[PDB]
C-alpha cells in the first residue's frame, strides 16, 4: 500500500533520490527537501561559464 522504500536496488535507490531520474546533480531521501539548483559561481562574470565536467569518481 506504500511505494516500497528503495533501500534494496541501487537503481531503485537512485530513482527515488533522483525522483525517477528527474534530479540531475542531487540525491535526497527527504521528501520535504526544498529543491534548489547550485548557485551561479562567483567567477562566471570574471571567467565566463565553463562546462562543468562530472568528477570521474
Amino acid at each position: 500500500f506504500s511505494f516500497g522504500d528503495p533501500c534494496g536496488d541501487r537503481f531503485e535507490r537512485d530513482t527515488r533520490v533522483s525522483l525517477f531520474g528527474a534530479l540531475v546533480h542531487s540525491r535526497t531521501y527527504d521528501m520535504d527537501v526544498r529543491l534548489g539548483l547550485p548557485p551561479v559561481p562567483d567567477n562566471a562574470d570574471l571567467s565566463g561559464l565553463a562546462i562543468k565536467v562530472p568528477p570521474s569518481v
Binding site: D9, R16, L19, G21, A22, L23, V24, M31, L35
Partner: protein
C-alpha cells in the same frame, strides 16, 4: 496569466488534467494553451514541453487501463502490465515530489531571483531528464504494443541493449521483473 497558474496547469497535465489556460488538444494528443494573447511564445513552448510529459503519462495510463482489463494477457502479460504500473507508481511519486516542491514555491510566495528558485525554465530543466525517461518508456510501450508471452519477452530482451546507462539499468530491472 500568472506563472503560478501555468505551473498549476502543467501539474494538472502531468496528472492528465487540463489546466485553466492549458487544455488537452486531442488532435495533437497534448495539452494546448488557450489562445489568450498574453502567453509568451517561450511560455507556450515550455507548456508544450510539459504537455509532452502529460501525453506520455496519458499513453501509459491508457495502456495500463487497456491491459488491466484483459484477462487474456496471461501471467506474463499481467507481469508486464504490473511492471509498467510499478514504473508508473514511481513516476507518480516523482510527480508528487515535484508537485510538493511547486506547493512549497507557492507557499513561500517570493519570486527569489536566486539560482535555486523553481522557475518554469528551472522546472523544465529538472523535468528534462524525467522527460527523456518518460519518452523512452513510451517508445518501449509502443514497441511492446500488441506483444504478449514470448513476443513480450523478445521485446524485453531487445530493450536490454540500450545505450543510455539510465535506460539500460531501467530496462534491465524491467527485464528481471518480467522474467521473474
Amino acid at each position: 496569466i500568472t506563472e503560478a497558474a501555468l505551473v498549476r496547469d502543467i501539474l494538472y497535465v502531468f496528472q492528465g488534467i487540463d489546466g485553466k489556460n492549458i487544455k488537452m488538444n486531442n488532435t495533437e494528443n497534448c495539452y494546448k494553451v488557450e489562445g489568450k494573447a498574453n502567453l509568451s511564445r517561450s511560455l507556450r513552448d515550455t507548456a508544450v514541453r510539459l504537455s509532452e510529459l502529460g501525453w506520455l503519462h496519458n499513453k501509459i495510463r491508457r495502456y495500463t487501463d487497456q491491459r488491466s482489463l484483459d484477462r487474456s494477457f496471461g501471467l506474463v502479460g499481467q507481469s508486464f502490465c504490473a511492471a509498467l504500473h510499478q514504473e508508473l507508481r514511481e513516476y507518480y511519486r516523482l510527480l508528487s515530489v515535484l508537485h510538493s516542491q511547486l506547493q512549497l514555491e507557492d507557499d513561500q510566495g517570493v519570486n527569489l531571483g536566486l539560482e535555486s528558485s523553481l522557475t518554469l525554465r528551472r522546472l523544465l530543466v529538472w523535468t528534462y531528464d524525467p522527460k527523456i525517461r518518460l519518452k523512452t518508456l513510451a517508445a518501449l510501450v509502443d514497441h511492446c504494443q500488441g506483444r504478449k508471452g514470448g513476443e513480450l519477452a523478445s521485446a524485453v530482451h531487445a530493450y536490454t541493449k540500450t545505450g543510455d546507462p539510465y535506460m539500460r539499468s531501467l530496462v534491465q530491472h524491467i527485464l528481471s521483473l518480467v522474467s521473474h
